[PDB]
């Protein structure tokens, strides 16, 4: 019962809040003589220095779990890739508080990686459910040539194949391209109207400008872009009427770290009350042994249930992602974000707010356009 938690938290106020949450969890629920220990380390900008410092300050401290948060800063990386890879050498589980990248989803690339927020899988699920409940049967996918975009495209295709539906065009464009006019013209020369977009901030801004200059902001066009494209230049140039997502609770660091601490404490208590746990290596350098209880801890975390959190029931999918996460269908109105739809418990509940469509539409448009020009 000398468990220690290293974790990686940005800034210092988050570190203090994590320490307070750890102390509160120690003084609540299952309490023993010595539950665990509280430690933390800053998320310094240098990737190599951060990785080496994390290894030195966590492996030597006999850590069982580590919480890592990814700031959404676009200019600098600050990605959890180095810490996740260093933890991948051993079998120490990690939790991603604000990891929105789909690269960590694959278990081969990151073996002992978990997180409490779905990067874009649940976003695509919400897209599919909204399309199903709003009577849409046409998809214009604008997935960029990136790993997260390809993962989102694969998830969307798998969801579509459940109802035996297929998008008429899944054309993709390379990130950073400034010649999306040809792609927009190809999209125009189709039988579909609903457009699904998923790209970076700069790419979203570029395609929004191209759509504005190609008269794609008029009536009959529906945009279901994700949360990543509702900030920065993407939000500045976003045409009115885009139905975006908000990821309710707003990737709140306090709530996420509290839930992570609770889940880690519950899993540690269950592991202690179940069987023995192999001690972590005493030093970051000296041994290359694989943890014999790492897969067991991963399975326990996967099967772990947490209902006392802010989001009620908390469970992990087969890929270690949050299930039934809360999402808000945000519709732009007069260059302002207005809440219309709420997603919770795989349900869609529109509110009294009207979802205004691009071009000043009052009624629900149709995804099928009868061109009457069958070549």
């Amino acid at each position, epitope marked *: 019962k000398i468990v220690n938690i290293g974790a990686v938290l940005s800034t*210092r106020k988050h570190e203090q809040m994590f320490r307070e949450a750890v102390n509160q969890a120690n003084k609540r629920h299952g309490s023993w003589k010595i539950q665990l220990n509280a430690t933390s380390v800053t998320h*310094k900008p240098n990737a190599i220095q951060m990785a080496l410092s994390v290894c030195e300050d966590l492996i030597s401290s006999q850590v069982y779990a580590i919480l890592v948060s990814h700031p959404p800063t676009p200019n600098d990386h600050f990605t959890p890739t180095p810490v996740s890879y260093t933890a991948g050498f051993y079998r120490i589980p990690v939790l991603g508080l604000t990891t929105r990248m789909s690269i960590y989803s694959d278990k081969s690339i990151h073996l002992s990686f978990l997180r409490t927020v779905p990067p874009y899988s649940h976003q695509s699920s919400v897209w599919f459910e909204m399309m199903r409940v709003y009577s849409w049967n046409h998809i214009i996918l604008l997935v960029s040539d990136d790993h997260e975009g390809r993962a989102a495209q694969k998830r969307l295709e798998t969801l579509l194949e459940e109802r035996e539906s297929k998008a008429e065009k899944v054309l993709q464009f390379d990130p950073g391209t400034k010649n999306v006019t040809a792609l927009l013209m190809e999209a125009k020369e189709l039988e579909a109207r609903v457009i699904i977009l998923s790209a970076s901030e700069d790419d979203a801004a570029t395609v929004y400008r191209a759509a504005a200059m190609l008269n794609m902001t008029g009536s009959g066009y529906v945009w279901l872009v994700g949360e990543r494209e509702i900030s920065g230049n993407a939000l500045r140039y976003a045409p009115d009427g885009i139905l975006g997502l908000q990821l309710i609770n*707003g*990737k709140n660091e306090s709530a996420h770290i509290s839930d992570a601490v609770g889940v880690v404490a519950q899993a540690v208590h269950e592991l202690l009350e179940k069987e023995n746990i192999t001690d972590p290596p005493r030093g970051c350098v000296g041994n290359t042994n694989i943890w014999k209880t790492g897969p067991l801890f991963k399975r326990v975390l996967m099967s772990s249930k947490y209902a006392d959190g802010v989001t009620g029931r908390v469970e992990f999918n087969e890929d270690g992602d949050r299930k039934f996460a809360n999402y808000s269908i945000m519709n732009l109105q007069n260059r302002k974000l207005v809440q219309v739809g709420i997603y919770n418990g795989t349900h869609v509940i529109p509110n009294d707010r009207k979802i205004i469509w691009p071009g000043g539409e009052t009624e629900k448009p149709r995804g099928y356009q009868m061109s009457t020009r069958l070549k």
Partner: antibody, heavy 124, light 108 residues
Framework: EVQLVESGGGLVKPGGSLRLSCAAS????????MSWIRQAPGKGLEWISY????????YYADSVKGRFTISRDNAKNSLFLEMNSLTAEDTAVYYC?????????????????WGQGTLVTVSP | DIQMTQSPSTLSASVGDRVTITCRAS??????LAWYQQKPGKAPKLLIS???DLQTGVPSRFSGSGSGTEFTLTISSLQPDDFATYYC?????????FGPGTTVDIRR
């Protein structure tokens, strides 16, 4: 255009109570964080406190801890600051600005835009 | 807490000359720092966020830099409207300490 209007200032003797009204225009105040910061004439800038969306978490500055009161009106889109036991160190211009707590996720605390501010001076 | 030191306290430069501002923190605060420009008799305005991002409506001449405990602000070309006092506020942890002045002015 976003403009912040500061009012409620004036002359208050030391040990008195004064109310500062921070009028917010061009945006909805309920979905943003606000803070008060003072700057003594010829000195640096000192942050006072911040008001959360829920209003249950305010971090008063150590110099003014337990003496000031902060309130907000979502319907009026205005911020009201209450100060008590004013002293010589309170002779500074107080500015209310939109914080960055709700900008991306949390934690960031850059202040923009800044209003013209108001001057509070104590004189017996 | 965290104390930021700017050296020199007062500096001058001519119009069109490169301007460098040095901000040093007491401890390593990664890149959680912001820059402000306060005109005489006017409230400060945010210029650089996270010491590496340029805010909208701000000319591209301003360019922040630095990481960890040392930060540097660089201006490609000085202009008359840039004559003001600059600060490097940090938000690593409460209290939100504010950096000292810079007092950018002209050299005769």
């Amino acid at each position: 255009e976003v403009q912040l209007v500061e009012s409620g200032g004036g002359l208050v003797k030391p040990g008195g109570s004064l109310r500062l009204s921070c009028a917010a225009s061009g945006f909805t105040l309920s979905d943003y964080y606000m803070s008060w910061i003072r700057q003594a004439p010829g000195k640096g800038l000192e942050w006072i406190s911040y008001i959360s969306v829920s209003g249950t978490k305010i971090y008063y500055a150590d110099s003014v801890k337990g003496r000031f009161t902060i309130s907000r009106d979502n319907a009026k889109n205005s911020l009201f600051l209450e100060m008590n036991s004013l002293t010589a160190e309170d002779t500074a211009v107080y500015y209310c600005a939109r914080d960055s707590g709700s900008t991306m996720y949390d934690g960031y605390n850059w202040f923009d835009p800044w209003g013209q501010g108001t001057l509070v001076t104590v004189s017996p | 807490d965290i104390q930021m030191t700017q050296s020199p306290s007062t500096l001058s430069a001519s119009v069109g000359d490169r301007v460098t501002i040095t901000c040093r923190a007491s401890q390593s605060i990664s890149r959680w720092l912001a820059w402000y420009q306060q005109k005489p008799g006017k409230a400060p305005k945010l210029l650089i966020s996270l010491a590496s991002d340029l805010q909208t409506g701000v000319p591209s001449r301003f360019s922040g830099s630095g990481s960890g405990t040392e930060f540097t602000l660089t201006i490609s070309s000085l202009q008359p409207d840039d004559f003001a006092t600059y600060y490097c506020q940090q938000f690593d942890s409460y209290p939100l300490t504010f950096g000292p002045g810079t007092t950018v002015d002209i050299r005769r």
